[PDB]
Amino acid sequence: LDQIWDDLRAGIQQVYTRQSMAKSRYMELYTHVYNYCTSAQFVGLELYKRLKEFLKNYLTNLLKDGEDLMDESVLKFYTQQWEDYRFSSKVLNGICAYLNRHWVRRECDEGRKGIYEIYSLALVTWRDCLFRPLNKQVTNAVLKLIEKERNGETINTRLISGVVQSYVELGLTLTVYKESFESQFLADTERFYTRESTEFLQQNPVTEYMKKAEARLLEEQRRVQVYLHESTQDELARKCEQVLIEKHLEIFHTEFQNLLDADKNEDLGRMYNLVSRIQDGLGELKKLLETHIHNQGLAAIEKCGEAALNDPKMYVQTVLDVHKKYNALVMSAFNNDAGFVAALDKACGRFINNNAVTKMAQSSSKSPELLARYCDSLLKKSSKNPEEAELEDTLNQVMVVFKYIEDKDVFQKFYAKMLAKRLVHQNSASDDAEASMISKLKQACGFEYTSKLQRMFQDIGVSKDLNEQFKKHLFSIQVLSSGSWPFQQFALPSELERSYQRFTAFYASRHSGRKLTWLYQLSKGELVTNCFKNRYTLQASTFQMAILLQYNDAYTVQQLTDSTQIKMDILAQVLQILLKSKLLVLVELKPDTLIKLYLGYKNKKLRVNINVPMKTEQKQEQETTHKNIEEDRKLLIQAAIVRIMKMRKVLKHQQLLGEVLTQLSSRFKPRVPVIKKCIDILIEKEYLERVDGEKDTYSYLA
């Protein structure tokens, strides 16, 4: 060992000198080892201990040079010396590879654990000698440099990477990386970001804070990749999120309301992106959104006032504007989340069915009525022919509104009645719109309801074909079925008597066995009155025709009543229209009052449309149809109760109510007192009875 130790030490000193290394010297140094080792009982000869002693004092001498350096110099010193030591230790391990082959491996096999390979020995000696004193200073230098980088200045990224790599490699794994660097790094992150957020929120607005936080998070994510280990992604991400977003959730919630007050789509999207990172943090935002939409809807409806009660268009347009605005907000800022669309739906379903208009009408059924009137106004002939593109979108939006209405039966009844009136009188703006509306109602409503509408259109077609065919045999006549159309049923003037018989004979001849009941309250036409001092014309109803044709002077109401056999209640109403048109002279009327004709009537244009609807007809119609709906509701409730009892013999009261509501949910929301009253009636009808004992339980009785 002594014969080769001096030259071996001289050679090893050359390796650690970090200079040009002769290849011949390498093989000579390797040759020394073979002679030293070769001569169980393996020949160790404490060469391992000798090289351990050699490596010990060298690192102490190296540490003497750099023990007093400041923050800036220690990084460069540690990086350079660590790189040189790693390279030289690799070379030395290459030189002494023979020992690791046999004797190092035998020592581990024998069970002794106080040993390591030459490279591992060099690393452990480094950790024990140089790392222990300088670790705190190096870590503090790295932290100061990182803090300098965070403030805007540019730093040398190569210094930190070497320190991180040296810390990672010394774990002989990341046992030493976390204990000496990562904990201090995370504590410094806490200390820096808490103060940064507190100072930033005090001066700058909350809106820019979201951008600042997202930029800081992206910067951290990039920085860890650039000059840190890849095992701290989740740790740093969650710690930074907790520091930045979680602590200020209260001010975030307070801001959200203001950002709702004035539309800021990008800001709301940024807040949603930031809060989504924290688990279980979006619920309160959903509650605020629901409440805000509800309050906005009621505020918008209240603004219109008493005019909206009789104006369907403004009411529907207000509802649609609110819905469109908040749907755009949900679909753009909140990225079509299920919770937010649910919040929109819940708020809409509440402010549509209950608002100021319904309170005035004292019933919740006014909204479907207004919707039906708006659709009918859209689909009538007006002074302006609608565009195809705009009408379809409005019909789509109306169908969107119809989904939130709990009382759909009122809408169905009103729409069917108005469509029947439009079809009879031939006043439809466009047929394609009607076809599209029926196609939509087919998907949105039941099958029994749509068959009624299809029957009306089939009747209209077969009647137009009949009229076209009969024109060749020879004034328009419409023949309708007795069940499909919702119309409920006078002396025919001699002026049109011939046409009556002419049409009746043809109808009887073409088809027999049918009785034709003639309706004169739905018949229109035009007048030719010679006894008017002018050559003019006036569109009028059949009742108005008979009233005008009779005077061709002054007559008593009783005389006219005898002449036309018209009931006085409707006679006064039809006469008031003529008086309101300034075509008669005597608001009140008397049975014996005399009515004359104002000769030389002056009008802006000859063509005057005196077929104005009566003052009370609309109100009477609304009350009648509301009473009819109320009457029809009871039958459905009774049928549902009977059919649910028929299959389940014994059932409880609460379960009964819950099942009836889900049975009738697609038409209306039943009231509990009505259901209780219907059950009481069914009991009196001996359809079911209550079992003795076990109160609040019903059983089916045959």
Partner: peptide, 11 residues
């Protein structure tokens, strides 16, 4: 002049 009328037919 021109007259438009409506009627219902039943068996």
């Amino acid at each position: 002049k021109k007259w438009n009328a409506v009627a219902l037919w039943a068996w």
